[PDB]
Structures are given as C-alpha cells and as structure tokens.
Design an enzyme around this catalytic site. Structure first.
Site, PDB file in Angstrom:
ATOM      1  CD  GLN A   3      -2.942   1.268   2.822  1.00 30.22           C
ATOM      2  OE1 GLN A   3      -2.735   1.569   3.825  1.00 30.22           O
ATOM      3  NE2 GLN A   3      -3.431  -0.432   3.168  1.00 30.22           N
TER       4      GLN A   3
ATOM      5  CB  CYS B 107      -4.766  -3.771   5.087  1.00 28.19           C
ATOM      6  SG  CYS B 107      -6.048  -3.874   6.191  1.00 28.19           S
TER       7      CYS B 107
ATOM      8  CG  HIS C  12       0.474 -10.400   6.969  1.00 27.95           C
ATOM      9  ND1 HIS C  12       0.951  -9.038   6.045  1.00 27.95           N
ATOM     10  CD2 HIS C  12       1.562 -11.287   6.795  1.00 27.95           C
ATOM     11  CE1 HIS C  12       1.586  -9.766   5.624  1.00 27.95           C
ATOM     12  NE2 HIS C  12       2.490 -11.286   5.529  1.00 27.95           N
TER      13      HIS C  12
ATOM     14  CG  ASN D 151       3.384 -14.369   5.156  1.00 27.32           C
ATOM     15  OD1 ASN D 151       2.886 -13.431   5.099  1.00 27.32           O
ATOM     16  ND2 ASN D 151       4.759 -14.058   5.299  1.00 27.32           N
TER      17      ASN D 151
ATOM     18  CD1 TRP E 113       3.923  -8.553   0.802  1.00 23.69           C
ATOM     19  CD2 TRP E 113       2.155 -10.416   1.089  1.00 23.69           C
ATOM     20  NE1 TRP E 113       2.464  -8.037   0.239  1.00 23.69           N
ATOM     21  CE2 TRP E 113       0.737  -9.175   0.813  1.00 23.69           C
ATOM     22  CE3 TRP E 113       1.138 -11.068   2.014  1.00 23.69           C
ATOM     23  CZ2 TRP E 113       0.024  -8.965   0.517  1.00 23.69           C
ATOM     24  CZ3 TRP E 113      -0.312 -10.598   1.864  1.00 23.69           C
ATOM     25  CH2 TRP E 113      -0.869  -9.692   1.167  1.00 23.69           C
TER      26      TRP E 113
END
Lengths: 699, 184
Positions: free
Chosen positions: A98, A104, A261, A285, A287
């Site tokens: 972002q 978010c 998250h 995850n 990311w």
C-alpha cells in the site's frame, strides 16, 4: 431509459452479454478501439471517463480541498520505472504494498489473485504490455452482481513527491496491481470509493465466486471438512489475524504477533500422530516470510512420531510460505474467508472439483414486490420466489445425515445512494421452505400468503444483516425448496442476484405466475339486452347508438361518483378514450350499443371488485391489493408486470384509486387482444413495422 | 456526503431543478410523477405568453415511465435533462402554432406543428394522435402536445432499441409487449 432499453439489454444478456466471454463494456469504452485510435494518431490514452483530476481520488477526504491529494502528479509507468513490466512470469513471492493513501484490505484481495495464474488472468488480461502497442491503455474484468464488466483505464497513477500513493510492488517494474486498483476505483466511481471495502467484496468482484466467511472464535463443528471440500475445489481460502486495541501478543506457544496480516489456507490434512490423529492446516504467507516456531508445534518433531515418510515426504515439499500448524491453530488467526469459485473459473482443468452454479436476478419494488421479512406476513408473500431442487446428495462416507449441500448467496445491487462500498446497504435475508408437493406451483404459480402461513421455514435466513451479500451454506435432504429473497422491512426498493453453489446439480427455477388473461366471452347482439339500456341509451346517443369517448365521460359521471368532484369523480378522459379503444373495432371513436353495454357491464364488474377490496367509502385502494384485484379480474402476471402497473397507476402514498384502476384494466385488456389477435397461431411473438408499432404504441 | 456531480457548465434553470431534486431526494436525485409535475408546472406555467394550465399527472407519469429503465417509478436527474431539453424545445414550436394564446392549437394547424416538431406521421398515426390526444373539438393544448411528443419520440427510440440489426421490424413475446405498452 425506459424498458425498451432494459428489455434490449435483457436480450443481450440472454444471448451472452455480461458473461466472462462477453464482459459488459463500462461507459461504452472499447479497449481495442481506443487503443487502436491512439495506436494510429501516435499518442497516449487520456481517459475521458476518469480524468487525472481530484474527483478520481475522492470527494474532500481524499478529495479536492484536502491536503492528502495536494501537489501530487499523475505519472505513468513510462516515467516511474526503467523497464516497466506489467506482470512477470511465475513470480515466486509477492511484494505488493500500500502507499501512504491505499487500504490494507486492497493488498489482500489483489495478492490473493497471485495464488493462481488462471484466476488472475480472469480479472487482468495477460495479453498486455508497455512494449508492443502501448498507447497507454489497459483493461480489466470486474464481476459486478452476477455479471462481468470490462473496464478501461489509462496508466496515469497518483504520486506525491514521486512515489506511488496507492498499491504498488515494492521492488519490481510491474504495474498490473497498480492499474488493477485504479480500474476498480473507476468502476466504483472514486478511488476513495474503495475505502470501507471488504476483501470478501473484492474477492467476488475479482472472481465471480462466492465468499463465505467464518469467525474463528466460534466456527462450525465441521469447519475442517468445510476447509477440505474447498481446498480440493480450488477455492481461494484466506485467514487473517485481528488487531484489537493494540493487540500484538503471543497467546500460548504461539509466537508474539497478533498483527492483521492476511494469510491463506492451502492445506488441511488429518494425520495419525502416535495414534492421536492430528488435523493439520497448512497456512501460506502471501508475501513469503515464514516466522513460526516449530514447523507444526506440539512437541514439534512430530514428523517422525508415528507419521511415516509415506506422508512425511508429502509435507514440506513446496516452497514459500511453508507452515502446516495444527487445526488447534484457532488460538491465533481471528478470521477466514474462502472464495468458492464458479464452474468456468478453472480453464476446465480436471484438477479440482467444481461447484454447480445457478444464479438468478430480482427486484424489490414499493407497493408490489417489496414484501419484507417473514416478520411481515401481510406483504412477505409478495417478494419474488424461486425453486431449489435437490436430488443427488453429497459424497463422503458419513457425517450428520441429510446429504445435499448448497451455498446460497443473495446480493444487493447498487442504487445512486451508496457513495462508497459498504454504505447505504439494505438489510437483506432470505427464507427457505420445502415444497410440500405442488406440481402446479412447480414453476407456474406464485405462492400466496396462505402458503408461508401454513408453512414453517427450515434453516432459511439466520438474521437479516446489513451488508452486500448475505450468505448461508445449507445441507438439506434431496427434495424441492422455495427461496424468498427480501429485505427486513417492506417498501425498500432494490435489485438483487441470488446464486447457488452446490456440490451437486440442482434444478433452480423462478417460481412465479404466467402472464394469463381470461374473462368475458361477450358474444354480441342487439336483443336480450332487453330494451333496457336500449331505451335510455339510444336516448343519450344523438342518432343510432354511437357515443364518442367524450360523450362516454359526461354520461358515466352522471351515474357514478354521485357528482361531487374530489378523488377523481367519474372517469378521466384517458380512461374513457381507453374504454372506447377497447371496443371500437373500426375507428369511429364512438361506441355503438352492443360494444357499450359491454363497457357498462364490464365496469359494473370493477366497482364490485374495487370495494370487495377497499372496504371503506374512501375510494382509495392500496397497491399490494392489486395482484389480488387483477386476479378476480381475469389477469395474472409475473412480478415485472405487477411492478410497472404500480409504478404507472399508483400514488406516492402507494395508492391506486378507481379511475386509474379502470384505465389500467381496460388499457391492459386491449393489448392482450391486440397481441392475441396478431398471434392466432400462438407462436408467442408478434411482428411489427415502425408504422404498425406507431399505430399501436399510441394506445 | 454533500451533493456532488459537478459540471462547471451549470445553467440557471437546470441547477434550480437540480437543487429541487436534492431537496426532495438528494444523493438519490430522483423524483416521482407528482413531484415532477410541480417541478414542470412553474417553468412552463409562469410565462404570460404561453397559454396552458400546466402538465397533468398522467403526463408526468408518462414522463416518468418512459425515462425510467428499472421501473422504479422515479425520474432520474440525468433523464430529466433529456426530457426538459425536449420540453423546452417543444414549448417553442408549440407557441409558433398557437400565436393567439388560447391554451390549445387549431385542429388542421397541428400537422404543421408535428411536421415541425420533428415528427412527420403518416395518415393513421395522425389519426391515432388526434383520437388519443385531441380534445373535444379536435384541438390540442400544450399538455397533450408535450405528452404526445414525449411518448412518440420514446416509441421511436424503443423500436430502434429492439431493432439493432435494422429490419424496420420487431418481434416481442407477451411479457415485453405488455411492459412496452403498459409502461409508457
């Protein structure tokens, strides 16, 4: 404007518009045409539907007076990075982030599309680059309430100081997520229209699927199987962690973060650990970075503890976001939503099971179909109605009787009032009742009050929430059910789409009345009328028996209304001109004697019908009481037609007086005989040239 | 939040319409048949050179229905500008054929007007419009004049919409037929 537009559009949809293949084109913009045009003039696209002005960013909160959107330059990727890549190959991780003004939730939905190459290529056409035929225009596909709309956008991005303010890849030279976001901002009207948004909302908007969500501190006692049937169904499952008042603790052997998250559930297997049987859930995850003590906690080295390599070799195979924590995981992770993809989502790859889909569409209109909840039985039975048919039940071995599972999602369309997403939502729900038999109402009858009155629901709506789509996963035995979508309180106009994801086929129809018309067979004559009307009528007719529409009026007013004007006394001229057209089979504009007694009699059959409903010398009828008034009048109709009648002859107080009730029935009886006569062979359709349409379109 | 939709190329009239719209609907910017009626019975009734008594409820209803695509019974804001443009236009032609202010237009004077309003009807359509709209004598006041023309133009657009290929012909089931003819 007007139904000829909507009918026209309904034809197109029926032929294939709004489908992923024939996505609807937002603001009539043509990506190819516009790109071709710029390709030619050797220039760059400047979107005329989405100016690089402040209104694209917002309305003074992310708007024009506000500092946030001050001194920031709309730069294209050409200038931003060296080798602007739109997208890149397999792309292991995901480093999307972002900007100082993004949201978010955004990165969650967008990042979720990187989990599948096939599902991203559906929202973002891969056939795009900054190398070959750039011109500065990109396009995207967004699913909008049961339909796909293709959106065009120029690569101008908002930057202050020279950095992207909204979503972007931290490393890279890729800009498809930046432009995917601007595109979604455009179809929502404002970049600031994205705020208030929910990833469940973006999932469906970026998917076509149905996202069911679950609170993890009070989940289903069958959530594991739920997670399993979805995972093997290519569903995009996403779990998150809550941030409650600076919540950033450990809670058990569980680490120390309680950060919000977004993570994904790519795995869920139940394994025998030293004879105990452990239900594991593999998280990933989006990311990359792992950071989770153990591998799978609980005396962790449980990959050697009666767990053979015949399943140990299966685990720890992959790469990136490699966890596998025990389902007891419920300690942490405050939430989970899975987008249960639609049949075509997967390029027919036999890779994952497929859901069965059957979406519909409806309206709620004040004074007709705006029935209300099961809470208001007076009007409830007036909401549109459907039929769910279940025959083939689920497959696994054994778990809680019944059989057939169907995930029902009812969604409400937008209506010039929701400045953002999530706001001005109607409280919506729906009720399910089982077909007790009806082979008549199987699809050609509209269930009245009496049926829902003598019929309980079963699991139905769990409460009418105030959000975009209200869900409800069921599992009722193999039979036939009726879904009645509605808001809570009556008179709340709105459009909707009611889809259905079932693990097995499920016949879903739109239970409603056929357009029926059946009343008098007034075989003419001169005699038998008994010289009654004959005498005094002929007296009213200047010569033979002809009486024009202007004569009919004054004559009919002397009779009814007793003569005191107020609340339309007598019959308006439009009514009278209508009462003439209904019997004047030549074009004299005046009525004879047979086709006059007809009017006199059929009218007598209207007063009786109006007062048998309006018990009160008030000369005022309510709206909802029309479906039933048109009933004992010979005509029936589907919900659409009831909606136009009320929208044409009802008051703002939702009232239709006698005069409008009469022109309505006469205007309506006339068109039936016109179509029925033009269609003797009963083909169901009629042909007409403009002239013909003109002779007819003017009443 | 506060009403948006900004053009910078506002106008006197319109924006007062626009302000009226918000004062009655706001962000909805939608008006009913009766609300509309009032909104038209001022910028058409206030002129000492136009002889009319204002638009009838049925007129506004037809005004609302022909511009209403979702059948909600409400006239949009943008759909109002199309219509009122056409209205401020047919008022013009109206007074050309009624230059002796009587609140109606001479029977055999009407053809010139329809031929002028951008509608050159054939024998029967002219018959249809008289039967349907001519008052008693066979004359026509501004109310029917405007309504007729609103309903007429919209039936040209309707046809052209259901005639994409261009066969000068159109097929409709009974559902459509009734919707097209009942909602006009």
């Amino acid at each position: 404007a007007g139904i000829a537009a909507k009918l026209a559009k309904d034809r197109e949809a029926a032929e294939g518009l709004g489908s992923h293949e024939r996505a609807i084109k937002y603001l009539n913009q043509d990506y190819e045409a516009l790109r071709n045009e710029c390709l030619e003039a050797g220039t760059l696209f400047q979107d005329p539907s989405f100016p690089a002005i402040p209104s694209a960013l917002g309305f003074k909160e992310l708007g024009p007076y506000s500092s946030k959107t001050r001194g920031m330059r709309w730069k294209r990727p050409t200038e931003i990075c060296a080798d602007p890549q739109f997208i890149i190959g397999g792309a292991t991780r995901t480093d999307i982030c972002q900007g100082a003004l993004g949201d978010c939730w955004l990165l969650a939905a967008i990042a979720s599309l990187t989990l599948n190459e096939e599902i991203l290529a559906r929202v973002v056409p891969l056939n795009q680059s900054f190398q070959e035929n750039y011109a500065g225009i990109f396009h995207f596909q967004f699913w909008q309430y049961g339909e796909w709309v293709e959106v065009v956008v120029d690569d101008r991005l908002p930057t202050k100081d020279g950095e992207l303010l909204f979503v972007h890849s931290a490393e890279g030279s890729e800009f498809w997520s930046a432009l995917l976001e601007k595109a979604y901002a455009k179809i929502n009207g404002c970049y600031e229209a994205l705020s208030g948004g929910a990833t469940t909302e973006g999932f469906e908007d970026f998917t076509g699927g149905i996202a069911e969500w679950y609170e993890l501190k009070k989940p289903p006692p069958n959530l594991f199987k739920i997670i399993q049937k979805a995972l093997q169904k290519g569903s995009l499952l996403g779990c998150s962690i809550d941030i409650t008042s600076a919540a950033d603790s450990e809670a058990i052997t569980f680490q120390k973060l309680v950060k919000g998250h977004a993570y994904s559930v790519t795995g869920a297997e139940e394994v025998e650990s030293n004879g105990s049987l452990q239900k594991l859930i593999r998280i990933r995850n989006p990311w990359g970075e792992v950071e989770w003590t153990g591998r799978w906690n609980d005396n962790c080295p449980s990959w050697n503890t009666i767990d053979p390599e015949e399943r140990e070799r299966l685990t720890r195979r992959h790469e990136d976001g490699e966890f596998w924590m025990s389902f007891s995981d419920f300690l942490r992770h405050y939430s989970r939503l899975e987008i249960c993809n639609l049949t075509p989502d997967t390029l027919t790859s036999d890779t994952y099971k497929k859901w069965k889909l059957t979406k519909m569409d409806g309206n709620w209109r004040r004074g007709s179909t705006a029935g209300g909840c099961r809470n208001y039985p007076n009007t409830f039975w007036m909401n549109p109605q459907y039929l769910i048919k279940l025959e083939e039940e689920d497959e696994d071995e054994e778990d809680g009787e019944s059989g057939c599972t169907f995930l029902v999602g009812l969604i409400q369309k937008h209506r010039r009032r929701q400045r953002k997403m999530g706001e001005d939502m109607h409280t919506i729900g729906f009720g399910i009742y089982e077909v007790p038999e009806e082979l008549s109402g199987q699809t050609n009858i509209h269930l009245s009050k009496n049926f829902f009155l003598t019929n309980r629901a079963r699991e139905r709506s769990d409460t009418f929430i105030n959000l975009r789509e209200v869900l409800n996963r069921f599992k009722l035995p193999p039979g036939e059910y009726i879904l009645v979508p509605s808001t809570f309180e009556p008179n709340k106009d709105g459009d909707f789409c009611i889809r259905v994801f079932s693990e097995k086929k499920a016949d879903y129809q739109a239970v409603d009345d056929e357009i029926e018309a059946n009343l008098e067979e007034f075989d003419i004559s001169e005699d038998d009328i008994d010289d009654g009307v004959r005498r005094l009528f002929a007296q009213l007719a200047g010569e033979d028996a002809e009486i024009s529409a202007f004569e009919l009026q004054t004559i009919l007013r002397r009779v009814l209304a007793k003569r005191q004007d107020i609340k339309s006394d007598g019959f308006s001229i439009e009514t009278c001109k209508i009462m003439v057209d209904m019997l004047d089979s030549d074009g004299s504009g005046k009525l004879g004697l047979k086709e006059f007694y007809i009017l006199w009699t059929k009218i007598q059959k209207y007063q009786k019908i109006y007062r048998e409903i309006d018990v009160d010398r008030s000369g005022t009828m309510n709206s909802y009481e029309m479906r039933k008034a048109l009933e004992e009048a010979g005509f029936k109709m589907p919900c659409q037609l009831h909606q136009v009648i009320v929208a044409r002859f009802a008051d703002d107080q939702l009232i239709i007086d006698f005069d409008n009730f009469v022109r309505c029935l006469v205007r309506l009886e006339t068109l039936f005989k016109i179509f029925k006569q033009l269609d003797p062979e009963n083909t169901g359709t009629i042909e007409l040239d403009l002239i013909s349409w003109l002779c007819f379109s003017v009443l | 939040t506060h009403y948006s939709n900004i053009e910078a190329n506002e106008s006197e009239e319109v924006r007062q319409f626009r302000r009226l719209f918000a004062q009655l609907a706001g962000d909805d910017m939608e008006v009913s048949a009766t609300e509309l009626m009032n909104i038209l019975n001022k910028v058409v009734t206030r002129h000492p050179d136009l002889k009319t008594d204002g638009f009838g409820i049925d007129t506004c209803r037809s005004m609302v229905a022909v511009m209403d695509s979702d059948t909600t019974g409400k006239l949009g804001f943008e759909e109002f500008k199309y219509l009122w443009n056409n209205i401020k236009r047919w008022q013009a032609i109206y007074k050309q054929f009624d230059t002796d202010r009587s609140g109606t237009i001479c029977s055999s004077e009407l053809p010139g007007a329809f031929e002028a309003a951008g509608f050159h009807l054939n024998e029967h359509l002219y018959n249809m419009i008289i039967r349907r709209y001519s008052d008693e004598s066979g004359n026509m006041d501004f109310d029917n004049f405007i309504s007729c023309l609103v309903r007429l133009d919209a039936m040209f657009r309707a046809f052209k919409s259901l005639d994409k290929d261009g066969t000068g012909q159109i097929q409709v089931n009974i559902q459509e037929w009734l919707q097209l003819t009942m909602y006009s």
